[PDB]
Design an enzyme around this catalytic site. Structure first.
Site: not given
Ligand SMILES: COc1ccccc1OCCNC(=O)C1=CC=NC(=O)C1
Ligand SMILES: COc1ccccc1OCCNC(=O)C1=CC=NC(=O)C1
Lengths: 304, 304
Positions: B41, B143, B145
């Site tokens: 992603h 951030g 991930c």
């Molecule tokens: C619903 O988001 C997604 C769905 C599928 C794939 C990626 C997604 O997110 C990307 C960015 N996410 C982050 O940076 C996070 C923010 C807060 N808490 C976390 O554990 C990760």
């Protein structure tokens, strides 16, 4: 989101751990620059620990009696000195993995990570708080002495604790890196009273703010209190009295959530008087006090 | 003595963390040998995440679009491929800090350490369990991930998890290092049902054995039970059914303490039916399930 009892990454500290042997005793040492620090009780035998005369025991020791090994390589000891309850072994080689570091004496209620070690090898890392009574509730077995506590601010490791012993009650005691014990403890195998401990009120409040930020809100109520009223409840439940300095340190969390510190105090008051009623906060069924306001902001902002 | 939610020392994993940027998105990557692994992603934008066509999005990307930085040095990307939900970026330089490693798919109920990272920099380390429903209750912000989960057996790091997302419920989902999600989760910004979770019965029993070893014994009773009787209680309280394989894994702890597994099951049965009555076990006011029998033996023996 989510809240965990997070420790600092231990890499910079793993690269400093060595094994120190003196006679039949083996424990852990910390190699920083050309000095290895370790608990002075490495020079003792079983008959000594009841009341060792460290000055006399150290006089029968020479540089070659201290065996220092960093992984598989042997370090050459060119000097030895006792500073309070720590031994400083001067070696002929500076540790190439020495990070930027400071020696700090932390305050009671502050938190730090411990890298538990055996035979100079790291086994695990966990986050601790220095109890108000200067003990730590760690996880240390035989051979863990010399394991250290630390905090990390960007590239600088502030070493704050070196493990020396387990009291008969199962709690832990140790020194700063200048070998001064935290609390009234002495490095002798004797029954030692640790004072009455109290719950770190400012940390419980910081953890309640972390709960609100992360979604656990059931404990928020329609009440407020005063520092005086709250402290009467804190007294009854063996909590540290809240001061204006504690309210001021909670400022950023109060600003972020919009919940005034005294309103959060009123939620804490109700929880102390009524319990959790079988509910949890951040996965805990008790009031957590090993997260400082700084820890909460750090974990909630993602400081690396 | 003492019992803590101990994580593995994170040093070997810190030396593998890199930052990966593709367009406007930055996340963490794992650099092992001449390959950088990261969540696929990283190639998405806000409009994409609702249902990204990863094959199409990746086709608009070239090796030079993936910016990989290890600290202050830039890595040269010479290949890119998608394997399930992970991207493998071939780089022209093998990571000199690559430890001995394996990629493993852990089972639900097993535990592992997570090194939370932001912009390729480690922020903290905590111990997690893979829930029976294949989610993890972590601490991850924007951030995070690409942060990984791992176990360490002497000098070998077994990487088991890579963080991909937070579900709308606040729990976390990710993949093994071959990019296969744990559980039914897909890498899309959609509401995703995580199944009914249960408490990891074998881990609670292992933690009860840790409590006895460390001195907390108040919960031991004069009763015993059978696997059938216990499982009727486990069913009622959403606990995983205990099997003979679970009893067999608890063998060493039963032998060490002299408390038969079914007798410990009877203590657990009474605790499930009556609660703690306001008492604690190993500093907890609830039944802890994120310690496996292997973790308990490891922490109680001092394996480095
Ligand atoms: C619903 O988001 C997604 C769905 C599928 C794939 C990626 C997604 O997110 C990307 C960015 N996410 C982050 O940076 C996070 C923010 C807060 N808490 C976390 O554990 C990760
Ligand atoms: C009462 O012992 C001492 C008093 C003063 C100084 C040293 C003492 O002990 C030396 C060895 N101790 C260990 O290796 C430990 C065993 C178990 N738990 C621990 O935290 C440490």
């Amino acid at each position: 989101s989510g809240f965990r009892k997070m420790a600092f990454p231990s890499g910079k500290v793993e690269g400093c751990m060595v094994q120190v042997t003196c006679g039949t005793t083996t424990l852990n040492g910390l190699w920083l620059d050309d000095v290895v620090y370790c608990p002075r009780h490495v020079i003792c035998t079983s008959e000594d620990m009841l009341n060792p005369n460290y000055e006399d025991l150290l006089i029968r020791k020479s540089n070659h009696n201290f065996l220092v090994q960093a992984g598989n390589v042997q370090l050459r000891v060119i000097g030895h000195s006792m500073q309070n309850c720590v031994l400083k072994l001067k070696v002929d080689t500076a540790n190439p993995k020495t990070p930027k570091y400071k020696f700090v004496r932390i305050q009671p209620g502050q938190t730090f990570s411990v890298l538990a070690c055996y035979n100079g090898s790291p086994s695990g890392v966990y986050q601790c708080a220095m109890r108000p009574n200067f003990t730590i509730k760690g996880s240390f077995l035989n051979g863990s002495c010399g394991s250290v506590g630390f905090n990390i601010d960007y590239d600088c490791v502030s070493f704050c604790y070196m493990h020396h012993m387990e009291l008969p009650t199962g709690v832990h005691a140790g020194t700063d890196l200048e070998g001064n014990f935290y609390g009234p403890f002495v490095d002798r195998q004797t029954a030692q009273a640790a004072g009455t401990d109290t719950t770190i009120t400012v940390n419980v409040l910081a953890w309640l703010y972390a709960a609100v930020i992360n979604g656990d809100r059931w404990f928020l109520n329609r009440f407020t209190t005063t520092l005086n009223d709250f402290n009467l409840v804190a007294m009854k439940y063996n909590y540290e009295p809240l001061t204006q300095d504690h309210v001021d340190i909670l400022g950023p969390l109060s600003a972020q959530t919009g919940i005034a510190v005294l309103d959060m105090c009123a939620s804490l008051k109700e929880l102390l008087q009524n319990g959790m009623n079988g509910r949890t906060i951040l996965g805990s069924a008790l009031l957590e006090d090993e997260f400082t306001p700084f820890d909460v902001v750090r974990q909630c902002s993602g400081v690396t």
